[PDB]
Amino acid sequence: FERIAVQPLTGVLGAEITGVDLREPLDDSTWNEILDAFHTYQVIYFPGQAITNEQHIAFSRRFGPVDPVPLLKSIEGYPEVQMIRREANESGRVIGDDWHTDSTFLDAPPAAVVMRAIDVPEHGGDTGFLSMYTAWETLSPTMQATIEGLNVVHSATRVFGDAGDRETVHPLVVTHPGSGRKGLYVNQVYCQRIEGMTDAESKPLLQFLYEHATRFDFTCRVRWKKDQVLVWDNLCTMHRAVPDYAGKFRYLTRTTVGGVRPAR
Amino acid sequence: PLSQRFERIAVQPLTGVLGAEITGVDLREPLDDSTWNEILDAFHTYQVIYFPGQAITNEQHIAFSRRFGPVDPVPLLKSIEGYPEVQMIRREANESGRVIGDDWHTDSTFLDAPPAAVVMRAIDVPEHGGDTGFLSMYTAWETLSPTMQATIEGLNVVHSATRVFGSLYQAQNRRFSNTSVKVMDVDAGDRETVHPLVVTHPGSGRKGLYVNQVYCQRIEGMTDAESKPLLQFLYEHATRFDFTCRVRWKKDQVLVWDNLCTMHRAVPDYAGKFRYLTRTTVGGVRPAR
Ligand SMILES: C[C@@H](Oc1ccc(Oc2ncc(Cl)cc2Cl)cc1)C(=O)O
Ligand SMILES: O=C(O)CCC(=O)C(=O)O
Numbered sequence: 353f354e355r356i357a358v359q360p361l362t363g364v365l366g367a368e369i370t371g372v373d374l375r376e377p378l379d380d381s382t383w384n385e386i387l388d389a390f391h392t393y394q395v396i397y398f399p400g401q402a403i404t405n406e407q408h409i410a411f412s413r414r415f416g417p418v419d420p421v422p423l424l425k426s427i428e429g430y431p432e433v434q435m436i437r438r439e440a441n442e443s444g445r446v447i448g449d450d451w452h453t454d455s456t457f458l459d460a461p462p463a464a465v466v467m468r469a470i471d472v473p474e475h476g477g478d479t480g481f482l483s484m485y486t487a488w489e490t491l492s493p494t495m496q497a498t499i500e501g502l503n504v505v506h507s508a509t510r511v512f513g514d515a516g517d518r519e520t521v522h523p524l525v526v527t528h529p530g531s532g533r534k535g536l537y538v539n540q541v542y543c544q545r546i547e548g549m550t551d552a553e554s555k556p557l558l559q560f561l562y563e564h565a566t567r568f569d570f571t572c573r574v575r576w577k578k579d580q581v582l583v584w585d586n587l588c589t590m591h592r593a594v595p596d597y598a599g600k601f602r603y604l605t606r607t608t609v610g611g612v613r614p615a616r
Numbered sequence: 617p618l619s620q621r622f623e624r625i626a627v628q629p630l631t632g633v634l635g636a637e638i639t640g641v642d643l644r645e646p647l648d649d650s651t652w653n654e655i656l657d658a659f660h661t662y663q664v665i666y667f668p669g670q671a672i673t674n675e676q677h678i679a680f681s682r683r684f685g686p687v688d689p690v691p692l693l694k695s696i697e698g699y700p701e702v703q704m705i706r707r708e709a710n711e712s713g714r715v716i717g718d719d720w721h722t723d724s725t726f727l728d729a730p731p732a733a734v735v736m737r738a739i740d741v742p743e744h745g746g747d748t749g750f751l752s753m754y755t756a757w758e759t760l761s762p763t764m765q766a767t768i769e770g771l772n773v774v775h776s777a778t779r780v781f782g783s784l785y786q787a788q789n790r791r792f793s794n795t796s797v798k799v800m801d802v803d804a805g806d807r808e809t810v811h812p813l814v815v816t817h818p819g820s821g822r823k824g825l826y827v828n829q830v831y832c833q834r835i836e837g838m839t840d841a842e843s844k845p846l847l848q849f850l851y852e853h854a855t856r857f858d859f860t861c862r863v864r865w866k867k868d869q870v871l872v873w874d875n876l877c878t879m880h881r882a883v884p885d886y887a888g889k890f891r892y893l894t895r896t897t898v899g900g901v902r903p904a905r
């Protein structure tokens with residue numbers, strides 16, 4: 353890395369990137385290094401990037417087409433820029449407070465999400481991430497061989513479920529179209545059953561994979577500060593909100609980068 | 617606000633659940649009463665506290681530890697030459713044996729009187745890799761439903777070291793290297809003790825869950841089949857990600873964790889890299905409701 357400075361967060365995933373101004377267009381050499389760090393570290397974040405809504409969209413477009421997720425509210429004037437907002441007065445349960453990755457009920461879920469902290473507490477409201485590369489790679493060779501050929505049925509029936517009940521089928525293990533690396537691909541929010549198996553057969557196996565994937569040693573924990581811009585890979589990671597900031601205002605915006613069909 | 621409540625130290629909470637960074641103090645020196653009382657208050661509130669940039673000697677490490685209570689080294693760990701009170705969490709860059717403490721537990725709960733706290737000091741740690749996770753058993757308890765609390769608050773739990781250096785350990789394959797771990801008597805590993813499932817912290821007066829899957833064998837009076845589901849639920853509940861924090865280490869960071877109201881976990885993400893911390897253990901008293 354010669355155009356940026358990269359500081360890995362853990363031995364598994366996550367890296368802080370400095371030495372670059374996201375308010376400006378990125379030359380080829382700088383963009384290529386950012387993409388290289390993204391593919392390697394899977395979640396990357398840039399402190400001190402007070403970027404406008406328009407600069408947010410422009411940066412996001414470098415990753416791919418900006419295709420908003422279905423269920424979130426957009427800011428006035430910018431359909432692409434969606435809100436993760438919780439009022440100080442707000443009670444109840446937080447958006448995304450279980451391990452998941454976004455919108456896997458889609459035939460082509462999002463490739464990536466670009467999140468920008470606008471107003472965040474001095475402490476509280478971290479976001480957890482984990483690597484599905486590491487999840488797959490830490491399975492024994494025998495377990496890998498055993499489940500590699502399985503497919504899993506996804507649907508949105510528990511988030512907003514007619515379109516919420518529509519099923520799609522994804523491989524249990526997918527090859528990342530950018531890195532070429534294999535990762536586990538299951539999540540408790542959207543996965544319904546292993547295709548072809550009975551309920552009794554499927555439930556314990558999915559349950560094990562949920563437990564395995566979310567092992568603490570496969571995770572990292574990102575702390576937010578105002579003007580922090582973060583990108584996560586929606587194919588090879590999962591993420592989780594942390595609701596430890598009752599009574600405090602928390603506001604981030606996000607753009608969603610379109611992806612292609614998950615493939616073996 | 618912390619900036620105005622604390623006059624001798626500066627406190628920066630790590631999460632909304634537990635953990636805090638402490639600065640404005642020199643651990644090389646004896647602590648005056650007001651400074652110590654503020655540290656103890658922060659310890660009781662935040663449950664795991666750490667002090668970056670404290671380049672201290674073994675003697676100073678021991679002296680600071682003694683403010684929390686009497687030193688009482690844990691049975692399993694080797695000590696450094698010249699300092700029986702200072703034990704090692706040391707992993708050579710080339711070793712590939714099981715990593716010490718790589719699942720959620722708290723220390724030596726098989727003792728009739730487990731440690732009250734541990735003071736850990738980073739000697740030589742990787743630039744990245746080897747974080748320690750912590751979680752609050754106050755929060756774990758307080759987030760159970762009223763009905764689940766009523767159901768289990770009267771239970772007691774059987775603890776032993778059998779999976780660490782007793783019969784169950786000796787009957788399996790994953791072994792610890794002799795870098796930091798002593799050879800132990802198998803009968804000592806199998807010795808059972810019974811503690812309450814919910815305990816009152818003597819310093820804070822608060823109630824916390826008290827179970828861990830390393831040392832807990834079963835709920836007293838129950839069969840294994842009866843105990844397995846309740847205990848397994850409690851482990852899953854306590855280790856919910858939103859009940860945790862994650863501490864990253866740097867050389868000369870000194871950390872204190874409360875061995876009664878927290879659990880902790882090593883993270884084995886630094887294969888091929890040297891990692892060395894020292895630690896003193898503060899003696900505790902019999903866990904009580
Ligand atoms: C110093 C410490 O002793 C321990 C040693 C290893 C250990 O590792 C584990 N980690 C995870 C699992 Cl599942 C089993 C185990 Cl056995 C835990 C504790 C103590 O208790 O005083
Ligand atoms: O608020 C957070 O930390 C993450 C929420 C989430 O899951 C998302 O934005 O998709």
Ligand SMILES: O=C(O)CCC(=O)C(=O)O
Nearest residue numbers: 705716717748881882883
């Ligand atoms: O090495 C670590 O991070 C923690 C090891 C541990 O569990 C202990 O020292 O008791």
Ligand SMILES: [Mn+2]
Nearest residue numbers: 448453454591
């Ligand atoms: Mn999400």
Ligand SMILES: [Mn+2]
Nearest residue numbers: 717722723880
């Ligand atoms: Mn331990």
